[PDB]
Design a protein around this ligand. Structure first.
Ligand code: K
Ligand code: K
Ligand code: K
Ligand code: K
Ligand code: K
Ligand code: K
Ligand code: K
Ligand code: K
Ligand code: K
Ligand code: K
Ligand code: K
Ligand code: K
Ligand code: K
Ligand code: K
Ligand code: K
Ligand code: MG
Ligand code: MG
Ligand code: MG
Ligand code: MG
Ligand code: MG
Ligand code: MG
Ligand code: MG
Ligand code: MG
Ligand code: MG
Ligand code: MG
Ligand code: MG
Ligand code: MG
Ligand code: MG
Ligand code: MG
Ligand code: MG
Ligand code: MG
Ligand code: MG
Ligand code: MG
Ligand code: MG
Ligand code: MG
Ligand code: MG
Ligand code: MG
Ligand code: MG
Ligand code: MG
Ligand code: MG
Ligand code: MG
Ligand code: MG
Ligand code: MG
Ligand code: MG
Ligand code: MG
Ligand code: MG
Ligand code: MG
Ligand code: MG
Ligand code: MG
Ligand code: MG
Ligand code: MG
Ligand code: MG
Ligand code: MG
Ligand code: MG
Ligand code: MG
Ligand code: MG
Ligand code: MG
Ligand code: MG
Ligand code: MG
Ligand code: MG
Ligand code: MG
Ligand code: MG
Ligand code: MG
Ligand code: MG
Lengths: 20, 154, 102, 123, 319
RNA sequence: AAUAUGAAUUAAUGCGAAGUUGAAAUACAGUUACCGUAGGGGAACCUGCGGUGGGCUUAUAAAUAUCUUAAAUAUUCUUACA
RNA sequence: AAAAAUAAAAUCCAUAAAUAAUUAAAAUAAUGAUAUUAAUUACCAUAUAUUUUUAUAUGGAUAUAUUUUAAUAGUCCUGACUAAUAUUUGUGCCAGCAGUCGCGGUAACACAAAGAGGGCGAGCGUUAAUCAUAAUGGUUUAAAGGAUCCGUAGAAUGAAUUAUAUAUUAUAAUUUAGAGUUAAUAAAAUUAAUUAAAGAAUUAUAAUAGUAAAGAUGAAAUAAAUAAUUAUAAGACUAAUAUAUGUGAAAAUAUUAAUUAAAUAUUAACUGACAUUGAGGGAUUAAAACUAGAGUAGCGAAACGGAUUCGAUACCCGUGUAGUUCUAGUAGUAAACUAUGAAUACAAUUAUUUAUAUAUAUAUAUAUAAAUAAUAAAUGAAAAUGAAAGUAUUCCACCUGAAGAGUACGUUAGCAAUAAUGAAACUCAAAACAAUAGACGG
RNA sequence: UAGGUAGUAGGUUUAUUAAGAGUUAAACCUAGCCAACGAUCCAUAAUCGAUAAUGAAAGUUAGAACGAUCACGUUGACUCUGAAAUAUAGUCAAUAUCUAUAAGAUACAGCAGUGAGGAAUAUUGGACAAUGAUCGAAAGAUUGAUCCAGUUACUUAUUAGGAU
């Protein structure tokens, strides 16, 4: 649960940084 | 024989992959008409009658004595590191023959999938047989002929 | 890489390309048709400059292999009208384009 | 398969969702009488005291229905209305009772999503 | 990835600092007051460069990208004014080079993000009278006037129809001072049409694009075979495109070729009218198998596509 | 006689927690596993007979070597000689 | 950059309704249930001008003006799929939420709420249903090639030329490239069935001298010998060669000989598409098992003992019954495996054998097939396949998540064990393959 | 559900009918007919469209509404009249109810309405003005056909305030 789902939020977060 | 025609279409694809300049096909009226259409449409460089061993240099009359040893020799074309004749497939298959009226042939050439036959693509040749003569589909439409959709060459 | 484009808007004809487990069926479309394809293919078409396209992906829908398959299909599975004409020694006419010509 | 095998029946299996509420007999909901109210333990990794109820539907089928919401006044012989929908963590509980219908009242003091818990709008 | 994003200005503005607890202000509201400038006692925004209409036939369309959000200028000298630390408006430190040489196309583009939308040219009151007098008095055809002034035939026909309405209004003194004031103001806001200016002239070769032709058919013919528009038309089973253009130019009511008589072949009977009868019967010959309301036709009244029409009186009626 | 219903009565099986008796399988799993079949045993399993590899192709030396002008000559050479 | 918020109020201007007048049309010869008609007009009527419409002026009508006048939406949702960033409170694996993955054990974006936000909107949500959403599929290794071959139907497929016809079919004639028949020449000695033989060894018995231990195991112990040399009897098996090479439909098949049957290549002549595949059906089919009668050395389920062990219903040892053998049958199952159905056309190389043919300056050389090995291309989830698992065509069998289950019930067949056929419910969001990097390995 | 069929398959003749035929009844012959491309049997279901839903499409689903067709009017059989009826007729019987107790009448699947069942589907309304239908020479009479309204967000559509 941790490994698989943790990145969903981070990789979308990477996209958050892209707009920043 | 549609089986023989399927064998020839597969044979030409195999020869194109290895890029042999010259190959032979069975000597029959259907095969000769098929090859002649490809030659006139620019898919084949040459079309010569011959034997099992090679094309004839001088005319050799065909008779029952040598019919079993006759072959048709066709020259394949390659330009810019690409085969001109890349694919050759039957439409009307031995176990499912497709006869279309001229109206449905016009729809096939207009982008409409008829009886699961994908429509004619740019630069593709679709051959039709009518009264034992092979012609391009566009020519059959010009002559108002209904016929069997045999094969598509690209 | 440069990809051939028919009228700088679409592909030349239809493409049935197999890239590993991905079966790509791409069809050319009329002007103003838009991109109606897998989302991965949509992004590639946008960057490449393809505006009109229809298609369906069968078997594997792995995003990575769809993208690579699409790029490969646009280069190895297309032939320009000019290349077909020269190879066959024939003239290929776009009927729709001639209809609106002088 | 060959062309003749397709002619003889061979083909792709059809895709259509299957019924998950067979006891309702293709009805949106069915009235029933509570036989016994019970408390059940979720399957792991969940932990809770899930309120359920055994119900005899008007068609004779006896089912186990989950009582949603915080707090319920369901008892034996209470008239309840059962709808489709399973309780994922409770195996064998494939139905829901409708709050605010029959003898089961709406959730007390429910503010949000009231329509799902039979709670009327506060003036 | 997507999140809610408050629509803050893309250009730099003076954000709110420490605020007195009762102001309850927002950064969006303060950015708007900076765009608008001060509001006078009359409720006007004189410092905003868009408050007043242009009077030189050049549209004053918003150019936020080129002026970087600086919308304030002196109301009389039209000289840029920007906010300073003191809270006052004064000359900018550096001139804006992006606002002095603007492309001609951009001047007519009202929306910064859409360069495919341009304003149309207003026709001068003189050209309209000339067109009106040529079609009506001199008896020229709409095709001739269209090819002369570079205007599409429908626009030519509309000008005649509208000038007729302006004559009746001026013949009954229905054009008031306010209407005259408004008309002149709006006339001085748009670029005037110049029949001589080639770029301003409207394209006169446009035809509707059919659907059967929209597909892409290809023919492999002999390398030296000529194939032209007429041959293509035969392949697509359509009239030549030039013929379509010619048939579309004979549609104007004042255009040459306008003809409608092949339909005057339907027997009609007007029933006898007697004194006291409130209506007359009109009978139109029809053919069995075509006339009549069909039996078992699809009822669409309870469907989203229910047919809705309008009668001669303009009343909404179900069809 | 069939169909439906209930039914004394009786068979098979799933899940849930949860201990217990052993340690059968996965490494050479500590007796190679499995297939068919037969017998035996609290339980897994054990034993006989043939079959399969989804285990051993994972495969890797008994070694032994020779004479023609060593240069005033080959080694150098830059479009030259011929 | 944290807003709520142009939102509110307020200001300007409207229309609906009301009120008043007017009033069609459904229907006309007349008749209107609907009906307190729709619509229109804003003091009513009239004249003139006047796309519409507008405008002026008039007759009557009220005190210069002319009826009055508005605007309270719900419902779901904001972790991902999936639009919803402004934060905050309560709860603490409880309460509860949940279409799927999941959330909750004290900083809960998921529970219950506040703020803010996103949908749809006189509807919103929810349940029950329908359509769509992958066969432009697969079966060596993931669900799936039938044990094998023979062959019937096939409303399955299938050569060549010409001429007709009503035309991808039919008919006729003609043809020999597929498929066959016979012979000639050369080659080979295998595979079936049957009959007749041989061989090494083993066990038992007896004799002989010769002794006191022998046999077994990890170590042990259980049951005139052991060893040696002779003689006799019995049953089963088949060392090297040997590669199961080869042969056979598969299962199978390697001591010898014989009889019968079948099997190879090329050439000559002949038939003239007579072919391919094959539902059903038929035949054959290891080991075990069973029926009847013989046989029984060795081996060996079971059983009874000896050991080992904490225990040992085992692994090891002893005694050893069924069985293993033969004859006549039943049965038709195996990891019956290449985990890969059969046929045809075709495609780039090398190496090594084999076969036939050719040549000679006689032992090689040159040809054409087959087999095997390694590959190109191609294919593939990859491992890999490689003349197929490539490019194509034809026919058959089979598969459609896991578990339940090759089970239950019924039926058919069998002496019997059983074999074939072969479900559903319940439950779950799993389950599986190839490959990668580790860890571990008595 | 693997065998089924015995008027069963076919032939000949009469009866019956406007008329063919094992359609029905009688007689006499032949041994056939159907079936693993599914017979027979069992279960389920009114059928369909230029109708509705869905899809790119082939299709799939529905069969309420509009229209077409069939069957039935509490159940079964039979008869009469007739061109045509096993008639919503008549006869007899079955089931239920009723009052007049008779070889009786009734059967709401006509309209409205009631109880029951169910998650769930409405007024015991107005009018023959319109379109039809029946009777009448006509005047006209009748018409729960039909046309209207009522109930119900069940569906669709319009409106449900603009500028500042
Ligand atoms: K074991
Ligand atoms: K076994
Ligand atoms: K065993
Ligand atoms: K809302
Ligand atoms: K595979
Ligand atoms: K072998
Ligand atoms: K012949
Ligand atoms: K056959
Ligand atoms: K068979
Ligand atoms: K024995
Ligand atoms: K094997
Ligand atoms: K087969
Ligand atoms: K049947
Ligand atoms: K109804
Ligand atoms: K009437
Ligand atoms: Mg909720
Ligand atoms: Mg989002
Ligand atoms: Mg052990
Ligand atoms: Mg073990
Ligand atoms: Mg082991
Ligand atoms: Mg034992
Ligand atoms: Mg064994
Ligand atoms: Mg292993
Ligand atoms: Mg291995
Ligand atoms: Mg009003
Ligand atoms: Mg009237
Ligand atoms: Mg908290
Ligand atoms: Mg959520
Ligand atoms: Mg919440
Ligand atoms: Mg709130
Ligand atoms: Mg609505
Ligand atoms: Mg599909
Ligand atoms: Mg296969
Ligand atoms: Mg096999
Ligand atoms: Mg198998
Ligand atoms: Mg031959
Ligand atoms: Mg001895
Ligand atoms: Mg041997
Ligand atoms: Mg071999
Ligand atoms: Mg066969
Ligand atoms: Mg025996
Ligand atoms: Mg033993
Ligand atoms: Mg047998
Ligand atoms: Mg078995
Ligand atoms: Mg088997
Ligand atoms: Mg074997
Ligand atoms: Mg064969
Ligand atoms: Mg069995
Ligand atoms: Mg693996
Ligand atoms: Mg008769
Ligand atoms: Mg009969
Ligand atoms: Mg008879
Ligand atoms: Mg029914
Ligand atoms: Mg249907
Ligand atoms: Mg209906
Ligand atoms: Mg149906
Ligand atoms: Mg109805
Ligand atoms: Mg009836
Ligand atoms: Mg009846
Ligand atoms: Mg009756
Ligand atoms: Mg009744
Ligand atoms: Mg009723
Ligand atoms: Mg009820
Ligand atoms: Mg009435």
């Amino acid at each position: 649960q941790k490994a698989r789902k943790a990145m969903e939020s981070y990789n979308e977060l990477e996209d958050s940084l892209q707009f920043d | 024989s549609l089986v023989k025609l399927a064998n020839t279409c597969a044979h030409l694809q195999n020869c194109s992959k290895v890029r042999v300049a010259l190959t032979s096909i069975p000597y029959t009226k259907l095969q000769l008409q098929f090859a002649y259409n490809l030659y006139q449409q620019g898919f084949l460089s040459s079309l010569q009658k011959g034997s099992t061993m090679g094309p004839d240099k001088d005319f050799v009359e065909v008779t029952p004595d040598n019919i079993s040893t006759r072959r048709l020799w066709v020259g394949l074309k390659y330009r810019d590191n690409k085969p001109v004749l890349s694919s050759c497939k039957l439409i009307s298959k031995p176990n499912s023959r497709i006869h279309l009226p001229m109206e449905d042939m016009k729809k096939l050439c207009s982008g409409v999938t008829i009886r699961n036959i994908k429509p004619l693509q740019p630069g593709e040749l679709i051959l039709v047989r009518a009264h034992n003569n092979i012609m391009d589909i566009n020519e059959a439409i010009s002559k108002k002929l209904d016929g069997e959709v045999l094969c598509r060459v690209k | 890489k440069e990809i051939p484009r028919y009228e700088n808007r679409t592909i030349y004809g239809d493409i049935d390309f197999r890239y590993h487990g991905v079966k790509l069926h791409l069809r050319s479309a009329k002007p103003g048709f838009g991109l109606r394809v897998n989302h991965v293919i949509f992004e590639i078409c946008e960057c490449a400059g393809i505006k009109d396209l229809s298609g369906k992906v069968y078997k594997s829908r792995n995003d990575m292999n769809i993208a690579k398959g699409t790029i490969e299909a646009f280069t190895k599975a297309q032939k320009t009208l000019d290349e077909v004409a020269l190879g066959r020694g024939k003239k290929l006419v776009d009927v729709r384009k001639v209809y609106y010509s002088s | 398969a060959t062309l003749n095998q397709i002619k003889r029946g061979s083909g792709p299996p059809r895709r259509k969702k299957i019924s998950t509420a067979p006891q309702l007999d293709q009805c949106p909901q069915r009235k029933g009488v509570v036989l016994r109210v019970m408390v059940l333990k979720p399957k792991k990794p969940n932990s809770a005291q899930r309120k359920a109820c055994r119900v005899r539907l008007t068609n004779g089928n006896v089912v186990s229905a989950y009582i949603p919401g915080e707090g319920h006044d369901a008892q034996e012989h209470s008239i309840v209305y059962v709808r489709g929908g399973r309780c994922q963590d409770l195996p064998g509980v494939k139905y829901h009772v409708i709050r605010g219908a029959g003898d089961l009242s709406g959730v007390v003091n429910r503010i949000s999503s009231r329509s799902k818990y039979g709670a009327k709008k506060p003036s | 990835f997507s999140r809610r994003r408050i629509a803050y200005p893309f250009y730099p503005f003076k954000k709110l600092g420490r605020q007195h607890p009762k102001k309850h202000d927002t950064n969006l509201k303060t950015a708007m007051r900076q765009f608008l400038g001060p509001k006078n006692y009359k409720g006007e925004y004189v410092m905003n460069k868009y408050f007043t209409v242009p009077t030189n036939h050049v549209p004053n369309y918003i150019k936020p990208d080129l002026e970087r959000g600086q919308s304030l200028e002196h109301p009389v000298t039209k000289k840029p004014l920007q906010l300073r630390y003191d809270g006052t408006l004064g000359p900018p430190p550096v001139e804006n080079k992006r606002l002095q040489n603007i492309f001609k196309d951009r001047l007519l583009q009202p929306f910064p993000s859409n360069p495919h939308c341009k304003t149309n040219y207003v026709l001068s009151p003189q050209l309209k009278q000339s067109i009106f007098e040529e079609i009506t008095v001199e008896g020229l055809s709409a095709q001739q006037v269209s090819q002369k002034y570079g205007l599409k035939i429908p626009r030519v026909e509309a000008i005649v129809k509208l000038v007729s309405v302006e004559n009746s209004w001026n013949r009954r003194n229905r054009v008031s001072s306010d209407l005259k004031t408004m008309d002149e103001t709006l006339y001085r806001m748009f670029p005037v049409f110049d029949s001589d200016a080639s770029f301003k002239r409207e394209n006169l070769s446009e035809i509707p694009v059919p659907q059967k032709t929209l597909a892409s058919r290809f023919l492999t013919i002999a390398e030296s075979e000529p194939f032209g528009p007429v041959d293509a038309a035969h392949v697509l089973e359509l009239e030549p495109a030039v013929e379509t253009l010619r048939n579309l130019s004979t549609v104007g009511e004042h255009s040459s070729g306008h003809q409608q008589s092949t339909n005057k072949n339907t027997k009609v009977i007007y029933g006898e009218l007697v004194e006291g009868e409130r209506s007359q019967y009109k009978f139109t010959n029809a053919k069995v198998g075509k006339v009549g309301y069909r039996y078992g036709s699809g009822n669409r009244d309870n469907k989203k596509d229910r047919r809705i029409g309008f009668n001669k009186l303009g009343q909404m009626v179900y069809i």
